[PDB]
Symmetry: D2
Subunit: 393 residues, 4 copies
């Protein structure tokens, strides 16, 4: 399996650039020059690179430094051919963002945070990004009385709608993608799961350009089924981007290589990205972005190995998932279990509520105990899927 730019594997600069500092220890790796990252990633088969404004341009950078850095970075882009599909803002590392950007209790700070996002939309626009991500990491609380929960959601809408309004105003071909996370760094984060982000979008003035950027590990941190979560995002036509990684349970976000967490879940995420829905439906057509961190135990060969591991993992799962649905045994098993039958509407063409209550065959004369005898054979369909995952079929 060799990734080619046609695969669309994108990586953030913070992923391979993550230095190894965590709650209990200092960095184990030297900083990564952004030019170097770009060249390395392009030699592995990456299609593009993403960044946070401060991944690239330091918080205190003078104008001269910003031009230099950008000059250096765009040169690397021109040399390698890498695209920049997504840009995001860091509204979490500086101490001023300790209570949030957009939902900070301090108003002067809320205003700076929205100003910092607006400037970053310009930059995103200049880099040719199609997506602008919002990961509200400091938006939330440790204690329940710290916030007025209705005012926090108004404050979040004000920021997102101002951003969206500004895109429309400038004529930028950019969409906003919110990235849910249930906790960490805060005790509780606002809009914690794919359903909470989708719900919020519907309350926005400019929600037509706002969608989601679900991350595997984030949903699994609430113990939810990531595949089910991206299926709801897809079904509402709001899956604008994805952050792929692995997580091994309900605990801190591990950010492991994609497929290095819940493998069977990973397998069915790739089937959904590649195969779409069994009865037809929208398909995810964007970048397959990896948002992970190379373990701090490993030196720089480990970093390039882990970059590679991501794309290898995606490609192997993809091979198996295509083999899985192409198998006649699997198709027959899907039929038997009623996967295709789920696709047929419950009512008949022009059959109303009254029409059906009335129909004696569907209710009064319906034989509930006979119907209950159906062997759905979901275990056998599950064994078939795993056997294809293990490469034994």
């Amino acid at each position: 399996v060799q990734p080619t730019p046609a695969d669309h594997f994108t990586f953030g600069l913070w992923t391979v650039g993550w230095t190894g500092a965590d709650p209990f220890g200092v960095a184990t790796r030297k900083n990564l020059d952004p030019v170097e990252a770009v060249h390395k990633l392009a030699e592995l088969g990456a299609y593009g690179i993403t960044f946070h404004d401060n991944d690239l341009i330091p918080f205190d950078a003078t104008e001269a430094e910003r031009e230099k850095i950008l000059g250096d970075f765009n040169q690397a882009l021109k040399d390698t051919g890498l695209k920049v599909p997504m840009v995001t803002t860091n509204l979490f590392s500086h101490p001023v963002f300790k209570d949030g950007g957009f939902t900070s209790n301090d108003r002067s700070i809320r205003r700076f945070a929205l100003a910092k996002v607006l400037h970053n939309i310009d930059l995103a626009a200049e880099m040719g990004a199609e997506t602008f991500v919002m990961w509200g990491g400091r938006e939330g609380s440790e204690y329940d009385g710290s916030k007025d929960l209705a005012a926090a959601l108004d404050r979040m809408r004000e920021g997102v709608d101002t951003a969206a309004g500004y895109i429309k105003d400038k004529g930028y071909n950019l969409r906003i993608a919110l990235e849910p996370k249930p906790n960490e760094p805060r005790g509780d984060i606002f809009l914690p799961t794919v359903g909470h982000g989708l719900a919020f979008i519907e309350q926005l003035e400019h929600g037509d350009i706002v969608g989601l950027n679900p991350e595997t590990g984030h949903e699994q941190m609430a113990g939810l089924n990531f595949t089910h979560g991206i299926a709801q995002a897809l079904w509402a036509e709001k899956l604008f981007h994805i952050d792929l990684n692995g997580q091994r349970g309900i605990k801190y976000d591990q950010d492991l290589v994609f497929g290095h967490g819940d493998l069977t879940s990973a397998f069915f995420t790739v089937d959904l990205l590649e195969n779409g829905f069994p009865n037809g439906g929208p398909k995810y057509t964007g970048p397959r972005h990896f948002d992970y961190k190379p373990s701090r135990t490993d030196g720089y060969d480990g970093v390039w190995d882990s970059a590679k591991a991501n794309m290898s993992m995606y490609l192997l799962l993809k091979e198996r998932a295509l083999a899985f649905r192409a198998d006649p045994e699997v198709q027959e098993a899907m039929k038997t279990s009623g996967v295709f039958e789920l696709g047929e509407t419950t009512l008949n063409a022009g059959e109303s509520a009254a029409d059906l209550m009335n129909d004696s065959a569907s209710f009064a004369g319906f034989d509930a105990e006979a119907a209950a005898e159906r062997n759905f054979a979901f275990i056998r369909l599950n064994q078939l899927a795993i056997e294809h995952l293990l490469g034994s079929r």
Copy 2:
């Protein structure tokens, strides 16, 4: 603390009627006559009673039996004065519902399930209920390939929209309330959290009459903040009902008495139900419904004790939550922490995106390190809240 009908404590018949059978053991209590439950609950201060169609009327009941039971039950209602604010359908106990009602793979079963709900809307209407609850307990899967996830959501919409359409058609003064649950009985349940239920409502043809019925324990089973979840439901004006109980962690749904789980969370749920939001906003005005199960270890004195425990727990939390916000120290502490400041809009009246990026005080000349010095004092606000919870203030 003595509950009076003015408190609006409602209980389902399945709660005190729960007999004690679980995964590993048989019932420890005799069945509860519904007439008796009604009389008992009315003597404790209950305001109303709720039920599932089969809690009352057996699945195989002949018409004569249904009239008898209903005659017996409405007589008890007339004698005690209890109201019936909510009615719900059992789409989970019979073996025919093993794969779901509305999202069953078998179409004949999907049709029976919708027929069973439609008939139950009539009954709900006849009992004078204001709310009709939908808890999709068997809608989901154990294995990821069992369902076409986009067709499961279409199938769920077909059922809910047909139900809603039928209410509108009959002129019934009833609203539908969906009740999210992340797992149990299925491995994964569709619409698993408050955000997922709210997201789905926005895709419905008749979503103006569809809202939520969040349950405490259900949200805590995903490890989410229940108070934050009902604040988002309130903020979207979709908190139509509530199921109160307690849960002690991420594990099976325990269904303990309300306040017998996460006490501090319970405390802040009551503050939100009673006090509303600190800066103003919608208020929950419905029944305070308890959906719990008396421990199987206890005999029938324990059952009435636990019914009582629920209302006692609510009333004690309520007393403390009113004392909490009335305290001048607490009001000052809320000010200092910026609880009130969160309520002020981020932008100035008629200030646009361009206007703010431009303003040098908000960005370019904003002093980020000085701003970061603010002591938000959230710990001290948290200690103040707990001290009022413990009755030491």
Copy 3:
């Protein structure tokens, strides 16, 4: 991969005999006759069968019924050659055990539970079982004040030492194995994980014959690593038996087929059971016992499919794990990462604490900054295992 008696695959009578009643519904399958169970299991390639006293003999059975059941049951064993390697007692389904068997607050229930176990040891010995499992499913509480926690453990010790002493006194060739479970059906069970189980055994008078019976799903309910957990039992020489199944997450116990839960974990469990430790050490030679339940959505064809699936899953993982370890590229990745270097003692033969203290090279002149550059290459080593698991190397 076709299993054969030589594989030592054993199944409980309650696994395939599980009829589908969960907490939200009734049985979806007809009762399985135990003689049919023996015939079907033997035909599939099983080596043995295990049971709970009330899995075979009803609670209410008379001595005539008991003798009748055992004679047919023993004839079936004969006809097929299945052994009965483990026997266990039901100390959880009847309403008398609602507060527990050995740790019930009621003393008369405690003597009844212990007498029920004492008679059951006699049946275990008669059947030729080598292991007597003890799963204390109702030993625990929902509320912290329900029990005197020191007393609960004194009473647990008393039951186990009385039973252990009875084995010793009659010279039966049997060992006791405790099976930890963190929760369900109690909110908290005593001896919740493998560590608590092992710790508890060291306080026993007759600890020499008491060991553990870990269950995959049970340690995963606390989010613990099952391979780490069994490694510690193995290391202590206390892994006497095992219960294999699957669990997707921290939630109720699912009891899926082994392999249908956390697959990467299942792969390494199989590497530890089959291959042991990289540097040598203890090995688990017992039966490979499946403690799972066929999903309630499926008819009896799915029950036999599921039994089959457990054995296939085990043999497919076994194969990948043998090929994984045999791979020269893997053995070289292991040597880079220091897997074999962990096997070396830290101290030199004859070195003492003082010796090492005052060895300048190990401390005072140690280059800590040079030692930290070591690329452990744990990521690469993990990718090699998944590629072997995926049937790609």
Copy 4:
């Protein structure tokens, strides 16, 4: 409730000295000088202070610097009278310990880690500490194939027995206390819960002087009951020290103030530390050590508030717990529920297993159906505890 030295409240230097760097941002507070820390703590009513060798003496410090630091530090102790009851080692922050101290795959890191601990025992003894804590924070893995699991435990044993033997050899008056942690910073830590810690100690050569140092937040990260967990350590005579804090859920460790997590659990922890067991047994007489971190959102006023808050929380719970147990209504609720009857031996003085077996009244003529009607009244008993906790009885 004002704390006083007699309360035996100790705080680590790293708790109040924690500056705010988390995984998504930098320090939000200035470094706290250790002499200031002693002065501030003593003034608040603390009895003692604990520290990690690098909390006081930098990793790079020269012998001149080390002696300079200790002389000022020892003068402050003198001036104030604070004791130093526990000393611990940092075997987790420097990049050399990225794979662990005692269980690092690299042998040279293993001798360095053990030498660092050996020198630290000498400092502990000089300071007059009675306890030497060992938190093995980097002993573990992210991937299952990274370690030989039996070797990891042999190496852990080797370090602890070498250190234990050194204490014994120099006649220091010190005990070792292991502090279990399930995850973070490793995906899986060896000896993840109290049970694994206790089990491991029984395999030690010098186990007599090795015990535990449980931490509230740490057992709650596996969803375990902290009161059950410490009860087992207490019952084993292995609770040598404790780390108190709060955690809201299975997620990263929050280290909130004690009481700001699971409050009902905190109440019963305090009842076990203060009051012991209802029927009598062992008691924990050590210091009440707070292992927490002041939230990064707050300035130094919140740091002193938080230190204060830990002590108040403990004294408020203590009070409620003394009044709870002293209550005649509670003592009568306890007697109904069988709390005192669990204290009776199941077997009669001199009864043997055979005796009970053949006692018709305890088995053969036992009315199991009559015994099951017993109302244990666990719900009512729980309501009495919450009402005492709520300051209402």
